[PDB]
From a paper:
The resulting Ser‐His‐Asp network is perfectly aligned with distances in the range of 2.5–2.8 Å between the active‐site residues.
A key enzyme involved in AQ biosynthesis is PlAntI, which catalyzes the hydrolysis of the bicyclic‐intermediate‐loaded acyl carrier protein, polyketide trimming, and assembly of the aromatic AQ scaffold. Since the natural substrate of PlAntI – a highly reactive, ACP‐bound modified octaketide is not accessible, we focused our study on a stable surrogate. The planar naphthalene ring is cation‐pi‐stacked with Arg24 (distance 3.5 Å), while the hydroxyl group of the ligand is in proximity to the catalytic nucleophile (Ser245OHγ, 3.4 Å) and interacts with the GLDS loop motif of Gly173‐Ser176.
Residue numbers in the entry:
A (entry chain A), B (entry chain A): 5 to 381
């Protein structure tokens, strides 16, 4: 027999998603090893290389679920707490990539996201970071909220810390990609706030995604204001992908509540829904819980009034070849918003510039620190 | 223009090395992101896909050096210590993969390994782990030695800790792959000992690799014996690749000095030198500092006398399709060494079973803990 390997065709086919799957080298956030991708794709059915097809992402979910199951078996039979957590993290990462682009079975997708959240809540007891977990009541909506503090934090010894609020994209999971981003701010002795708004994290497939997410961010700001451990005059809001769109909304509506805002490849409007690749349509359809015919109408409502003033400092990281949020619309916003907006545009980079994420998160993390220092920190 | 990507041909060509390049998801040890591989291989010259060729690994070194240089620029212009260290780690990882399979310019290879060691020694001041760095004098040889302690270690509060000694392979760097392995033992509140024997780490290309490495391990055991912080009755020796061969030697000569020994894909003898792929010959040639004609004679001297008794518990992880250390020779040793030896053989896995490294290091780390517990810990 030959050594277990990913077929040349399939490996080349998934080139767009490989940067997404590996994402950031994290300390706490679940992350796959190369071997996990091999375990998933080594026995992937032949003649199935269409990313637009529903058949491809079914087999993707099936095969990634198998690797997830294997790590849960290791976790259950683990002889130490450290080994148990390592296995649970690997399982959580595998289950996320199984579901993140799977929208065919609503019940199965919710189940996989419930697995990940169960693993996350259970891991908190073994964590060496203080995690204040509670529900924020916004009207009738009970929003899952997590306030995480830096390593070796003591309330008595330390002064009120700055806090960074981070928002999910359309297909991200809170304790995976967003916790991965959050570690760059925890590393700089900042508190971090991660949340599941309507249609976000565990709520994806249950409640429709709220276009007016700033309403839910306002409720987080109110909590941080009342929290003595948090310096409410030193707040940042970060958004990634569709989360970046919410960042631009926050900058317009409640921007004066923040020292700075980070937009990771969000835009003032999305490209033509019909012309989107076939999986992004289903992605958007599932997040908003609407059919094909209704989506272009929602995209029209989403389109921002760029005229409305920017109430704080905004830093945007965007790729030239972004096929979701078109660069021309972002450069239009950059010119109009003027000195309040900073644009880091990457040549020959796709949506979220994932080939540059390590270097641009170093720059982004330093930029946020500078904005707090400029506000007398 | 198209998005920056690794060519399907080159990505398929490097399938054997991708598990090696990404290795383990580490906290401290330098590690590449997917984007770093893209930055290295995106502009790799076309019609250059021969892994046996000297031209391929020159361009490999050139292109990986470029990514290393980029991270050093980020490190120098970094606005924080945390950002500086993140960049230095990325640079160190990039420079290692530039040199690890490059043997054409001895001066350039030593320079790249000197860059990595300089970055490592400079990072120690920013480390939250206690790193006792000194030289162990073995005859006339000044051996670089690093004794690292677990997170939040206090000598006064804590009792004498167990310590794991880890050995380099032929083409590994101490603060990259071996520190990555070491983190599994630091996570279990064990001290770790990593060293540069003759022809190992910074000494590769300077001094020939010592076949009798147990002589240098004996000097480490003597230091750990004299060290009050280390429980010398609770010692383990781990070796990876050719380091695994040293582990089998240690088990025979000074095995009674260790509770247990871990052999990660070492063997009692190497396959026919002439029949090795063309880059492993140059690899072995460079490590031993000998020409093609002399190597098969050294391989004959290397071959262990399996008859000699095993003086401690040994755990071997090996792949069925290992083309360096043949499985039949390891299974021969397993049968003869009997109850003292445990074999974890992976079906359809190559040398070091890199597609399984996460799961087998979880099992290995738990096995070592169990052997210490059996010796009254
Ligand atoms: O929706 C997202 C959230 C976080 C990261 C992403 C990267 C690529 C594409 C989409 C993403
Ligand atoms: O020599 C080595 C040291 C550490 C890890 C390795 C993995 C594969 C092949 C060789 C290796």
């Amino acid at each position: 027999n030959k050594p277990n390997r990913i077929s040349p065709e399939l490996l080349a086919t998934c080139g767009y998603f490989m940067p997404r799957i590996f994402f950031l080298n994290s300390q706490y956030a679940p992350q796959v090893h190369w071997g996990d991708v091999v375990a998933a794709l080594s026995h992937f059915p032949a003649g199935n290389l269409d990313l637009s097809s529903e058949e491809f992402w079914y087999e993707w979910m099936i095969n990634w679920s198998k690797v997830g199951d294997s790590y849960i078996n290791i976790a259950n039979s683990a002889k130490s707490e450290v080994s148990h957590v390592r296995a649970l993290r690997s399982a959580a990462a595998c289950y996320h990539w199984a579901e993140f682009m799977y929208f065919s079975d609503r019940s199965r997708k919710i189940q996989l996201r419930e697995y990940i959240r169960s693993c996350f809540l259970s891991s908190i007891k073994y964590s060496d970071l203080l995690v204040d977990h509670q529900y924020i009541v916004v009207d009738k909506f009970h929003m899952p909220f997590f306030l995480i503090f830096p390593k070796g934090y003591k309330e008595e010894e330390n002064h009120p810390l700055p806090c960074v609020i981070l928002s999910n994209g359309l297909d991200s999971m809170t304790e995976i990609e967003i916790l991965s981003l959050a570690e760059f701010f925890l590393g700089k002795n900042m508190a971090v706030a991660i949340f599941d708004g309507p249609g976000q994290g565990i709520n994806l497939g249950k409640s429709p995604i709220a276009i007016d997410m700033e309403l839910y961010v306002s409720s987080i700001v109110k909590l941080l204001e009342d929290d003595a451990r948090i310096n409410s005059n030193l707040l940042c809001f970060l958004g990634i992908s569709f989360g970046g769109y919410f960042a631009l909304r926050v900058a317009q509506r409640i921007g004066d509540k923040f020292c700075c805002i980070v937009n990771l490849s969000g835009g003032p409007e999305i490209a033509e829904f019909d012309k989107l690749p076939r999986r992004l349509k289903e992605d958007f359809q599932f997040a908003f819980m609407q059919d094909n015919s209704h989506m272009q109408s929602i995209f029209d409502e989403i389109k921002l009034d760029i005229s409305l003033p920017c109430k704080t400092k905004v830093f945007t990281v965007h790729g030239e070849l972004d096929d979701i949020f078109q660069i021309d619309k972002v450069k239009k916003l950059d010119q109009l918003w003027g000195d309040n907006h900073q644009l880091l545009c990457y040549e020959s980079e796709a949506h979220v510039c994932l080939n540059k994420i390590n270097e641009y998160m170093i720059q982004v993390s330093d930029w946020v620190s500078e904005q707090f220092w400029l506000n007398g920190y």
